Amino acid sequence: ISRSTSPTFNKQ
Amino acid sequence: RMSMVVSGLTPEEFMLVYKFARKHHITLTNLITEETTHVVMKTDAEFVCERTLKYFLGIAGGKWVVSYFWVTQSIKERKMLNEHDFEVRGDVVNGRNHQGPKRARESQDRKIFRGLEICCYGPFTNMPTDQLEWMVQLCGASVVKELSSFTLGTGVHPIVVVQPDAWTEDNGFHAIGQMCEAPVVTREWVLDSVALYQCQELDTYLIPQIP
């Protein structure tokens, strides 16, 4: 969904 | 009044917002601050987004975390629609309809991290440790900086938060106990709790500590 340079946190 | 921030938008979508912010005189920018009132998230048709730093902070601050569809549809009806009709309903990790944003807004009187003392100990990727702190602050926690610093009495619960994969590929943090009596949890304990805006049980996030 997110199409920017912004990091996503969907795991760790 | 009205100060926007964008997340997950291509430069292209950012302009439709700029064009939208221009018309309605909204303060649109790149950095999310304390004066920001709205966090516009790229979402799917069902208002579900991915978890970005801005998403977490928007929730934590009790701001309007709204689908980018709020802009496109308003732009369509030449009139600024109601934020509530486009508020983010959930995300790709904690649930598609958990309603965390709305709960944060309606729970500003009872912050989930109320009465908690948290120290974001160790390295952190993609989210400056200072941001993770501001996040636990906005959510009501008390920020500590020093393992051996926590407040020693009984009206307070100390929590140590770490990102296990933010160090190496050899161990070394199953040993944070030897520096305190506080429970140690992965950073996910904070991210999940904040996204759902409900303090989570530490159980599934606890990190086994040596003696």
Swiss-Prot record, chain A:
Phosphorylated. Phosphorylation is necessary for interaction with BRCA1, and is cell-cycle regulated. Changing T5A: Does not affect the interaction with BRCA1. It is found in: Nucleus; Cytoplasm. The modification Phosphoserine is found at S6. Ubiquitously expressed, with highest levels in testis. Belongs to the DEAD box helicase family. DEAH subfamily. It is linked to Breast cancer: A common malignancy originating from breast epithelial tissue. Breast neoplasms can be distinguished by their histologic pattern. Invasive ductal carcinoma is by far the most common type. Breast cancer is etiologically and genetically heterogeneous. Important genetic factors have been indicated by familial occurrence and bilateral involvement. Mutations at more than one locus can be involved in different families or even in the same case. DNA-dependent ATPase and 5'-3' DNA helicase required for the maintenance of chromosomal stability. Acts late in the Fanconi anemia pathway, after FANCD2 ubiquitination. Involved in the repair of DNA double-strand breaks by homologous recombination in a manner that depends on its association with BRCA1. Interacts with the replication protein A complex (RPA) via the RPA1 subunit; following DNA damage they colocalize in foci in the nucleus. Binds directly to the BRCT domains of BRCA1. Interacts with the CIA complex components CIAO1, CIAO2B and MMS19. 4Fe-4S iron-sulfur-binding is required for helicase activity. This is Fanconi anemia group J protein. It comes from Homo sapiens. The gene is BRIP1. The chain holds residues 985 to 996 of 1249 of the full protein.
From Swiss-Prot, chain B:
Changing R51W: In BC, OC and FANCS; impairs protein stability; functionally impaired in vitro. Heterodimer with BARD1. Part of the BRCA1-associated genome surveillance complex (BASC), which contains BRCA1, MSH2, MSH6, MLH1, ATM, BLM, PMS2 and the MRE11-RAD50-NBN protein (MRN) complex. This association could be a dynamic process changing throughout the cell cycle and within subnuclear domains. Component of the BRCA1-A complex, at least composed of BRCA1, BARD1, UIMC1/RAP80, ABRAXAS1, BRCC3/BRCC36, BABAM2 and BABAM1/NBA1. Interacts (via the BRCT domains) with ABRAXAS1 (phosphorylated form); this is important for recruitment to sites of DNA damage. Changing R187P: Mildly reduces affinity for a BRIP1 phosphopeptide. The chain holds residues 1649 to 1859 of 1863 of the full protein. E3 ubiquitin-protein ligase that specifically mediates the formation of 'Lys-6'-linked polyubiquitin chains and plays a central role in DNA repair by facilitating cellular responses to DNA damage. It is unclear whether it also mediates the formation of other types of polyubiquitin chains. The BRCA1-BARD1 heterodimer coordinates a diverse range of cellular pathways such as DNA damage repair, ubiquitination and transcriptional regulation to maintain genomic stability. Regulates centrosomal microtubule nucleation. Changing K54M: Abolishes interaction with BRIP1. It is linked to Breast cancer: A common malignancy originating from breast epithelial tissue. Breast neoplasms can be distinguished by their histologic pattern. Invasive ductal carcinoma is by far the most common type. Breast cancer is etiologically and genetically heterogeneous. Important genetic factors have been indicated by familial occurrence and bilateral involvement. Mutations at more than one locus can be involved in different families or even in the same case. Changing E146D: In BC; uncertain significance; functionally neutral in vitro. Changing G140V: In BC; pathogenic. The BRCT domains recognize and bind phosphorylated pSXXF motif on proteins. The interaction with the phosphorylated pSXXF motif of ABRAXAS1, recruits BRCA1 at DNA damage sites. Changing K23E: Impairs formation of a heterotetramer with ABRAXAS1. Isoform 1 and isoform 3 are widely expressed. Isoform 3 is reduced or absent in several breast and ovarian cancer cell lines. Changing T43I: In BC; uncertain significance; functionally impaired in vitro. Changing M15K: Does not abolish ABRAXAS1 binding, but abolishes formation of a heterotetramer with ABRAXAS1. Changing M127K: In BC; pathogenic; strongly reduced transcription transactivation; abolishes interaction with BRIP1 and RBBP8. Changing P128S: In ovarian cancer; uncertain significance. It is found in: Nucleus; Chromosome; Cytoplasm. The gene is BRCA1.
